[PDB]
Design a protein around this nucleic acid. Structure first.
Lengths: 300, 252, 256, 307
DNA sequence: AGGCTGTGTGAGACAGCACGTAGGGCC
DNA sequence: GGCCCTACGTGCTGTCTCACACAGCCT
């Protein structure tokens, strides 16, 4: 009964080492529970290796609207942006090494699993735990609320897969902060993509009067080639709650089309959490193109 | 208790094995010593700013550009604009941002530029870039760029035309405003009317999977063609209501 | 955070109070008054439901009936009144009879072993002759068995990738006039019209190649009477749900 | 001012607590359990009791009657259109441990797998028959061993029942959940007319019980590696593939009646209770088949394998 | 005597709750 | 000012985790 009383003290004296050496403040580095030390050391070594293989400066992260994230084949985040705390209530220290499958909705695991496996560009929507209340006060992880993140990036291989995803959030229409412009009109759609309340700005941009759109199905305006993309986006919106579309042509009132880009949202009832209606924000990327042709019956 | 302790021991063993594999150089005690020695040789944040830029530019696949808040002037632009937008740094230095975008998109940039910002424009090369940034004292704006025979036609349940792409001018010969309002069976061969009618009344029953048929299609000049169509019915993802019957007409 | 938990608890209590406000028929901006009124209403009205209501609730959902039989002899000790709406039989017929008599005379080997501690079996009983299947389930007590009884042109022909007849539905005896055995083992191309094999070959090579999508084609099939008739086909390749491999081609030789 | 203001608040709180603890006495529960119930539980139980009594009086309106619940092998569970459970059968403790008092009144979506929150939503909202599978949390292990909530293992239930609309529109769903017994721990006897099996992941015969020869006619060693889809009648292929998909995505299923080709012609109806196996990834699939009738139409020949 | 597994211990931090006082808002 | 619904926090208990103590094994 000496080694047990000696090695255990020896191990702690050693485990305190490999912890103070981490690139973190000494005060914080001295308060780790003998497991985060390894969880951080292994991640730091792996990201340094991957960094080495791949290999105004301090303004790139500040300019960015999202948080960088790295995921390996298993799903262990080996690095996260220092500003993740702003969006998600979690911090880099306590979320660097945990399996990504532990911080995602169970229904969305399949998409991530497919994306990780090896055309290298990737684009998917996943739900990640968030512990930041609407008022801005941080809350404990025991009351996490799901948040949708729009992720883009490309899979990479180093001398052994990897993934570099730059996730961003989607602004809520009712809590908008970014200023608008002269080419943005709001709108409200029924749960089956049926117009129910349209802003009066369409009369100047597209060519449809506000009273001529209330009731007609939305799918009867998108160009045929974009029907598949719009159906996929609407399905994602219905299943998740928020979606950002691509670039789908929209038919005008006298021919041609004008490009758009939609950032949908869903509003939930506060008495039974039954979805009420779909709210969308529409951008415009150009003017009327090919105005001397007729596509649909309505325009004729 | 026992299960939790067993899981903790297994996790610790796995972490020890992974750390041993990481190091290049045991008794579960020399491993930590070797790891700390290796860490001492290398190396306050996890990664340096340049190392973070090397990852941001590889993930986002964009660049950084600085513009003024007075006359849309550019003070400095990152060198990464050579691979993307196909242009040298000379043009993007001392010029005006409004002169590097589509003429029809000037108003959007003019309104957005004049403490966060976000918009979509099309810089010269045309491409689509999702500008995002903020405002810092200088007033100047700092933002990071970014980057993103057949004939289709819809149909109603009965079969009346409702939409035809502009490719009809070449695929068949008619104008897009002629086929609208006329049943497809009218343009089909008299002998093949039965097959097309049966397919049109069967596709609605066969919902969710495409159906393919073949027949003869007319043309602006009296003759016969061979068009293979892959028509599949459409249903709303939520309500599941039959709306229209897409017909991805193909020429064979 | 303590404040967030307290706010959530307060909101939940307020929502419950609002719900109880509407639930009470008698009822008013108050909380103590609303609680007192709810108590007063509940005064007019051990388990949540009496034993007489659980029976109705179970009968509405499961749509079954309770029957009792004796293991030694099989005589029906008691049958619930709900037997009539289910099997369209009066209580008198079931009562005093033997359970073995109320089943079609080939499933006796099941009930005989089952009756002679939980019991569960699938059998069929006469419908007052149409026969229906009911999932009898119950336990055994002192020795008697108690158990509720719940309740629940063209011919398809598979094919091989080459076009061989791997299956022929019994309807072919009338739809085409050929015995099923004759068509088996022979390529469908042979039975086609003298010079029409090009269309069928193209359709078969396209159904297996167009990522498994339904195709339709018309031809002139023969018959035992040596006549040509137009019968359509709907061909699509089956795919394994998990492995996602080609199993066979399912053709519905619909007759015009 | 402050001295008098605070005094009224104390009296108001005392009165509220007294009324709350007096209300709980009215519930149809023993005084022992009622006394220690917290306020929120009392409110939830009162709401559930009122709603269930209203439904029973509106829509659902004796010597041997108590035996009904005991005979039934499942547990009734009324679910409203908002997902709230307004009544759970008292015998739910045996199947899942969670007592009626603890669970009654809670939202159903909180006690089910998140991936199964769409099937329930579709089924609850409006042909007034329902037959679907769901995954529900459990706290009882094999043979009966209560544990804490956080150690819950999901169970699959064969939910059956019919919706019912009662005028206040409000619609209450009545279901009869039935857990599927694990083949590894069978408790009910297996009668003679049955033959066990064991299939691979993609539904290939890997091992068949010897009784198949007496029942159908195929030799036990004659069906190894052959895909099962080559035997089912072409009419039941849709049902069988749906059942296989449900088995893959939900652990266990109880496939509906279908027809299986036998030897020398004919077929025999079968009912299968599939059950996946999880390696402490999936390994293999077992089945507990049933036979309902002897060979029908022996003379007729359908497939090439029978010629 | 070396490290390796299986077993129970005391201690700090926890969420649950109820109950306090208090601005503040309808009469 | 007359009530009455909300907003933050003292203290408490019952749980959670974590690292520290005897059993035992091939080099």
């Amino acid at each position: 009964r000496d080694a047990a009383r000696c090695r255990r003290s020896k191990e702690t004296e050693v485990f305190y080492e490999l912890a103070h050496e981490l690139p973190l403040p000494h005060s914080v580095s001295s308060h780790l529970d003998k497991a985060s030390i390894m969880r951080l050391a292994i991640s730091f070594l792996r990201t340094h290796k991957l960094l080495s293989s791949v290999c105004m400066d301090n303004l790139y992260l500040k300019a960015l609207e999202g948080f960088i994230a790295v995921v390996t084949q298993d799903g262990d985040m080996i690095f996260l942006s220092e500003n993740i705390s702003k969006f998600m209530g979690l911090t880099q220290v306590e979320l660097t090494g945990h399996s990504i499958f532990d911080f995602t909705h169970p229904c969305d695991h399949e998409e991530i699993r497919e994306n990780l496996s090896l055309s290298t560009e990737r684009d998917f929507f996943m739900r990640m735990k968030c512990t930041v209340t609407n008022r801005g006060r941080t809350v404990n992880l025991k009351s996490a609320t799901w948040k949708v993140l729009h992720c883009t990036g490309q899979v990479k291989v180093y001398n052994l897969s990897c993934l570099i995803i730059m996730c961003e959030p989607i602004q809520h229409p009712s809590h908008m902060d970014i200023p608008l412009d002269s080419k943005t009109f709001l709108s409200r759609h029924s749960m089956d993509m049926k117009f129910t309340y349209c802003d009066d700005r369409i009369t100047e941009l597209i060519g449809y009067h506000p009273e001529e759109l209330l009731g007609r199905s939305a799918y009867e305006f998108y160009h045929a080639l974009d029907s598949e993309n719009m159906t996929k986006s609407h399905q994602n919106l219905c299943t998740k709650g928020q979606v950002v579309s691509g670039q789908y042509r929209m038919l005008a009132k006298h021919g041609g089309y004008v490009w758009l880009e939609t950032q949908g949202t869903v509003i939930y009832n506060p008495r039974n959490l039954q979805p009420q209606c779909i709210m969308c924000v529409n951008y415009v990327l150009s003017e009327i193109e090919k105005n001397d042709v007729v596509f649909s019956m309505d325009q004729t | 208790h026992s299960e939790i302790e067993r899981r903790r021991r297994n996790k610790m063993t796995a972490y020890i094995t992974e750390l041993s594999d990481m190091v290049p150089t045991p008794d579960k005690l020399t491993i930590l010593r070797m790891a700390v020695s290796h860490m001492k040789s290398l190396r306050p944040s996890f990664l340096t700013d340049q190392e973070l830029k090397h990852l941001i530019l590889e993930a986002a696949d964009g660049f950084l550009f600085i513009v003024s808040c007075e006359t849309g002037r550019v003070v400095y632009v990152s060198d990464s604009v050579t691979p993307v937008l196909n242009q040298p740094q000379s043009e993007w230095f001392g010029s005006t941002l409004y002169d590097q975008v589509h003429p029809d998109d000037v108003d959007k940039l003019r309104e957005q530029l004049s403490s966060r910002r976000s918009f979509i424009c099309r810089m010269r090369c045309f491409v689509v870039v999702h500008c995002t940034g903020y405002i810092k004292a200088w007033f100047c704006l700092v933002a990071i760029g970014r980057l993103q025979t057949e004939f289709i036609s819809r149909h109603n349940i009965e079969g009346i035309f409702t939409f035809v792409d502009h490719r009809c001018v070449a695929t068949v010969g008619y104008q897009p405003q002629e086929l609208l309002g006329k049943n497809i069976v009218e343009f089909c061969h008299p002998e093949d009317q039965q097959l097309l009618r049966d397919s049109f009344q069967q596709v609605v029953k066969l919902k969710g999977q495409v159906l393919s048929v073949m027949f003869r299609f007319r043309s602006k000049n009296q003759e016969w063609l061979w068009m293979r169509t892959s028509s599949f019915t459409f249903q709303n993802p939520y309500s599941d209501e039959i709306e229209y019957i897409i017909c991805t007409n193909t020429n064979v």
